[PDB]
Design a binder for this molecule. Structure first.
Ligand code: SF4
Ligand code: SF4
Ligand code: SF4
Ligand code: SF4
Ligand code: SF4
Ligand code: FES
Lengths: 226, 198, 588, 180
């Protein structure tokens, strides 16, 4: 397939959506709800690009790059002013209720939400009202739960139920009181519940065994092991 | 408690040679001539201490001999570069006993911010240091405070009076550290002036 | 169009002249944020292009800079020729008030360029430093030895595969190096240093260093002497090398600012300004007016401090040891104001990407008013005490004089270049930091640069800096001390302390570092001792891919042999006192 | 040389002698340390301390931003947690033989715990005693920032401050609540 991003022509795979095609080209589009292993649902509304009907077109339309196929002869723009404004607005809407928690949160320095807040360029707060608050649950000895940091990107439920086949983690509640967790306090029964700490782009699910002796990612000495 | 150089020993101090030792130490500590050794910005603050606004001349440390033979104290004030390290060691060897060393600044202490391929990480890697001053640069009054610390360090050390009579080893007092001595008053600090005023 | 916008500078007439002379396919024009046209020239046409630029109707007369870059780890090289290494030549045309950056691409195996010294004599030390730090050989160089590292040094430190951090110390290396320090006087060969016909047997060799009894730093000069007459001399530098560029490749854009302080340690904020300006060019930040006036205030205060210390040290080197005490009291007044504003005396580390670390403290205008009332009487007292003395005039007038041609061909800037009659100050020709809103004069000389002419020009520059400080005190805008940009590092502290998006920006900027997009930026400013410049190459990361600091004391120390040839040792001492150099500026 | 030059030189030497004597007849400009205490501005960058909140607990949440913002790497700390869930440093040490007193750690602190104080008298006999542990840093009061409390802003629940009790936070709403 042939696509044109910001006036530059690229050859991609036509069976892919525009988000994974543009991320494979090295282009940067912010995203929360999409995962390569989980597919596209169009939930977080973060990956908005501006699509044009043809080569000569000035109006365009904000489309969802994870929900849009990278068909042949596509014309999109990432650095369009309206697209950038909407992506910053989506980050701002996510940050209206986010707790002032980065120093005492185990996802600090490893947080996808931090990376995409910085990458959209949103650093000024004009929201002056209250932030919603959630109680936490005990999820067992391995996963630490902090529902205040949730952005309702639905990655946890999608992975844990649709992918990993687990049955004890779900989404509850309503409009802006959506709660992601177990129906009651208890250990997460799945044998692959540890991948929630990497699936969750925020610090809702964290490695508790790491949290006992916590250090940030920049302070780690890493090796590739088996 | 003392330390030997020729070993952790005790205080060996009739009464006449005791008064002689106190008089010799008093004369040594009240007349200390630093060696004029310019390395880096810490020497700029050293000569700022040398001027009239701070008056290092009050302590009798203003003669500033240009030859290492006539100097008793080496103030290593600057970065210890790899090219300049043999020069520092040769100038230290040219000095004569008794000799003391004051490291001025984080570079002379440990290499400071310059953990780099061409900097020796501290002057204590090759010459012994008597007093250390943190700072980058330490202010001139901090250098004078280090001079006072060296003065009370000298004032109770024991050295031979003559080269033909007595023990020729040098005693250095294991002094109580300034950190543990000042911890009693430093921790009790509760309020400081806000940084929005002059 | 903002000043930080990426421009290819194809409308520059130098591009059209080069296209007409060499052809449209002879070179590649690169779009940068340096503000100058960057032209990639083939290696075999480098001397032809240099000669063509030298013989222009308004020629490029000064080789401003010459160094190298390791391009092997540079991922974003779109629109660039294939290069393992590159050598860049920054040339300034004063008549056009323009500059051009030529770039030569070299493969990893064929690391040799023709020498540039037959066109510009400052290319001697520039190519020696390029060979020392990058291993690039210059064919036709008279003596290509290491200038920063010792001769018995393995590897080239500014290469990407060289480890930046300090190796383990060994007393064996120190002891053997003491042995070569011992036999250096005995086994001295003038052929190693480029001298000829050493020991006729009417010449003796004199070594001044390594430690001088002065505040300009520690370095050596070896002199060929007939009695008291100097015939040949080369300076031995590199004794103050701190690896500041290599440190710039291993610090973030924010954490490198204290290292920019200690380049010229009598400069402080004057050294901080070009770095933060070039980083703001990379970040696309236009700072507000209050930031501009605050930075101008601190730069002029530190310029007055450096000029006072320079005049005091020159007077002391002449022989009068009295006025240095009073002028250090004046420096204490300046340090009182600087301590009040920035919290530190000599290395404030106060300029930030997008602004300054804090707002001005309540009561800064009082201290500034007392300092401005205190200064002029003390300045007149120092003038009448020493700079109008006949003994000082006899010691300083006519000593190590050079004209406009010698200053142009050796890259001399600052007081010497203006003493040669050339009116070139960066604060007026290529203004920065809102210097167009200040009314001040640029003192120039009669056409011959003596010691006395340079010292009096520095006194006039101190007077003009006092005028700029008066304008800063009288007219200061009320507003933000930081920019409204997302890349302002760090963000304002109160919004960090109570807003979560600002806390996120602060968290990721102080920990991993701010992400500058891949571009090349250049800022050239008028420092306290000449013309300073920062050339920053970003690969898109949170650290600098390449930090290149051009300092004027390098050019002054390289002009030392060409001006003192045929003079006495006391003339050399007066000349060294009248340059206004620091060894940290030379060796960096 | 010219006789006029000699007369001018003698006159300017006499002028130099007279003005040096007038400087001798002037007032001293010496600050007499240590009898006269050195005036330091409130934001002077001297000895580093760790501070406390108005409630009296230590302000450091062991977030490791000061240690990474240090261009010298002379801060080393480890995070520990109490039973109620508040973060604190298990140890906190600073190599003051390496610290350049640049103030980047105070600038990077999101709780205003680490601060640089007007204190320069820090000389030491041994370099091992320039490593200041947590007992040498933590002071009994807030320091230069007298009223900031990070845990009043954080959403993380600690002792004495439950969920929804922070600034600009609503009370938690159960998903089982009857209200729409
Ligand atoms: S989840 Fe991310 S944005 Fe939220 S407090 Fe943790 S590090 Fe900060
Ligand atoms: S808990 Fe994490 S993975 Fe689940 S919706 Fe919230 S932010 Fe997404
Ligand atoms: S410690 Fe700082 S002020 Fe002292 S020599 Fe080193 S860089 Fe200069
Ligand atoms: S003042 Fe600077 S050098 Fe010292 S601990 Fe803080 S960040 Fe590190
Ligand atoms: S930045 Fe402040 S709160 Fe964070 S670890 Fe350092 S002193 Fe503690
Ligand atoms: S990533 Fe496309 S809407 Fe979430």
């Amino acid at each position: 397939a042939t696509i044109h991003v910001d006036g530059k022509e690229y050859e991609v795979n036509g069976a892919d959506n525009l988000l994974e095609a543009c991320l494979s080209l090295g282009l940067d589009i912010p995203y929360f709800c999409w995962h390569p292993a989980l597919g596209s649902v169009g939930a977080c509304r973060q990956c908005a690009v501006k699509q044009y009907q043809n080569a000569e077109d000035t109006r365009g339309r904000l489309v969802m790059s994870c929900m849009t196929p990278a068909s042949d002869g596509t014309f999109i723009s990432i650095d369009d002013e309206e697209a950038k404004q909407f992506r910053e607005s989506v980050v701002e809407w996510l940050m209206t209720n986010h707790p002032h928690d980065c120093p005492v949160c185990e996802e600090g320095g490893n947080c996808h939400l931090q990376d995409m807040t910085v990458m959209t360029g949103h650093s000024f707060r004009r929201y002056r009202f209250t932030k919603r608050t959630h109680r936490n649950q005990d999820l067992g000895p391995f996963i630490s739960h902090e529902m205040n940091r949730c952005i309702a990107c639905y990655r946890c439920v999608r992975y844990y139920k649709d992918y990993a086949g687990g049955t004890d983690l779900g989404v509850y509640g309503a409009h802006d009181n959506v709660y992601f967790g177990r129906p009651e306090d208890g250990t997460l029964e799945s044998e692959f519940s540890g991948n929630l700490v990497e699936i969750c782009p925020t610090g809702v699910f964290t490695d508790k065994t790491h949290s006992e002796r916590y250090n940030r990612k920049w302070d780690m000495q890493f090796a590739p092991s088996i | 408690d003392y330390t030997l150089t020729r070993e952790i020993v005790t205080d060996p101090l009739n009464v006449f040679m005791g008064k002689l030792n106190d008089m010799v130490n008093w004369g040594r500590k009240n007349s200390i001539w630093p060696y004029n050794f310019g390395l880096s910005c810490c020497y700029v603050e050293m000569v700022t201490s040398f001027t009239a606004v701070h008056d290092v001349a009050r302590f009798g440390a203003e003669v500033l001999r240009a030859s290492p033979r006539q100097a008793d104290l080496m103030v290593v004030a600057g970065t210890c570069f790899t090219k300049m390290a043999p020069v520092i060691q040769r100038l230290y060897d040219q000095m004569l006993e008794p000799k003391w060393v004051i490291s001025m600044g984080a570079c002379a202490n440990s290499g400071g911010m310059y953990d780099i391929y061409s900097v020796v990480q501290g002057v204590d890697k090759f010459i012994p240091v008597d007093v250390y001053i943190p700072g980058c640069p330490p202010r001139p009054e901090a250098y004078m405070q280090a001079l006072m610390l060296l003065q009370e360090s000298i004032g109770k050390e024991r050295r031979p009076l003559s080269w033909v009579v007595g023990d020729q080893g040098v005693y250095r007092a294991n002094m109580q550290s300034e950190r543990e001595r000042k911890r009693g008053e430093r921790i009790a600090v509760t309020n400081l002036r806000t940084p929005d005023e002059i | 169009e903002p000043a930080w916008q990426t421009r290819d500078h194809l409308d520059d007439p130098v591009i059209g002249e080069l296209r007409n002379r060499f052809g449209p396919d002879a070179f590649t024009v690169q779009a940068t944020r340096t503000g100058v046209p960057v032209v990639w020239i083939k290696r075999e046409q480098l001397l032809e292009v240099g000669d063509f630029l030298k013989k222009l109707p308004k020629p490029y007369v000064m080789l401003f800079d010459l160094h190298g870059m390791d391009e092997r780890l540079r991922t974003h090289r779109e629109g660039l020729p294939a290069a393992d290494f590159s050598v860049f030549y920054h040339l300034i045309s004063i008549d056009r008030n323009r500059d051009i950056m030529l770039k030569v691409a070299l493969a990893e195996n064929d690391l040799h360029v023709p020498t540039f010294t037959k066109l510009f004599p400052n290319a001697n030390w520039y190519e020696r430093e390029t060979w020392d730090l990058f291993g690039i050989t210059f064919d036709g160089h008279p003596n290509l030895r290491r200038i920063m590292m010792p001769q018995t040094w393995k590897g080239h430190p500014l290469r990407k595969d060289y480890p930046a951090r300090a190796t383990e110390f060994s007393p064996f290396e120190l002891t053997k190096a003491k042995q070569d320090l011992e036999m250096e006087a005995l086994t001295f060969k003038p052929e190693e240093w480029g001298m000829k016909r050493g020991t006729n047997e009417d010449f003796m060799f004199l070594n001044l260093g390594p430690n001088h009894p002065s505040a300009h730093g520690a370095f050596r000069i070896v002199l060929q002497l007939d009695g008291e007459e100097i015939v040949d001399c080369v300076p031995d530098i590199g004794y103050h090398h701190r690896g500041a560029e290599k440190m710039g490749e291993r610090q973030s854009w924010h954490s490198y600012i204290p290292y920019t302080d200690r380049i010229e340690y009598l400069g402080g904020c004057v050294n901080e300004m070009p770095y933060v300006l070039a980083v703001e060019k990379l970040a696309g930040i236009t700072v507000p007016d209050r930031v501009n006036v605050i930075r101008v205030m601190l730069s002029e205060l530190f310029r007055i401090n450096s000029h006072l210390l320079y005049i005091s040290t020159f007077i002391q080197d002449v022989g009068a040891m009295t006025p240095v005490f009073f002028a250090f009291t004046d420096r204490q007044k300046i340090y009182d104001l600087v301590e009040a504003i920035t919290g530190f005396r000599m290395h404030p580390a106060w300029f930030r990407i997008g602004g300054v670390a804090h707002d001005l403290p309540r009561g800064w205008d009082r201290l500034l008013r007392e300092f401005l009332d205190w200064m002029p009487k003390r300045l007149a007292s120092y003038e009448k005490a020493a700079l109008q003395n006949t003994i000082l005039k006899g010691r300083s007038q006519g000593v190590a004089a050079y004209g406009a041609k010698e200053a142009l061909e050796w890259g001399t800037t600052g007081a010497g270049l203006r003493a040669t009659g050339i009116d070139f100050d960066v604060r007026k020709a290529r203004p920065y930091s809102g210097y167009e809103n200040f009314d001040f004069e640029i003192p120039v000389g009669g056409g011959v640069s003596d010691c006395y002419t340079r010292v009096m020009l520095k006194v006039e520059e101190l007077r003009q800096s006092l005028r700029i400080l008066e304008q800063c005190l009288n007219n200061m805008p009320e507003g933000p001390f930081k920019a409204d940009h997302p890349l302002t590092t760090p963000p304002p502290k109160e919004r960090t302390l109570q807003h979560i998006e600002t806390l996120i920006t602060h968290f990721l900027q102080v920990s991993w570092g701010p992400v500058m997009p891949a571009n090349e930026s250049f800022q050239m400013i008028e420092a306290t001792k000449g013309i300073n410049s920062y050339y920053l190459t970003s690969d898109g990361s949170t650290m600098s891919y390449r930090t290149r600091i051009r300092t004027p004391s390098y050019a002054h120390l390289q002009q030392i042999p060409a001006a003192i040839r045929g003079s006495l040792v006391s003339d050399l001492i007066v000349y060294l006192g009248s340059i206004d150099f620091v060894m940290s500026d030379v060796d960096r | 040389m010219t006789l006029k030059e000699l007369l001018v030189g003698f006159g300017t030497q006499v002028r130099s002698i007279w003005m040096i004597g007038l400087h001798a007849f002037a007032k001293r400009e010496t600050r007499m340390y240590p009898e006269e205490p050195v005036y330091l501005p409130p934001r002077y960058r001297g000895r580093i301390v760790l501070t406390r909140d108005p409630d009296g607990e230590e302000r450091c949440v062991a977030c490791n931003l000061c240690a990474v913002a240090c261009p010298v790497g002379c801060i080393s700390l480890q995070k520990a947690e109490t039973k109620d869930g508040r973060w604190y440093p298990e140890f906190f040490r600073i190599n003051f033989s390496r610290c350049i007193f640049c103030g980047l750690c105070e600038e990077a602190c999101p709780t205003t715990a680490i601060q640089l104080t007007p204190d320069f008298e820090m000389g030491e006999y041994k370099r091992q005693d320039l490593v200041y542990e947590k007992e040498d840093l933590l002071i009994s009061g807030p320091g230069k920032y007298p009223e900031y409390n990070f845990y009043r802003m954080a959403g993380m629940a600690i002792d004495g401050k439950d969920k929804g009790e922070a600034e600009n936070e609503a009370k938690p709403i159960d998903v089982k609540s009857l209200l729409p």
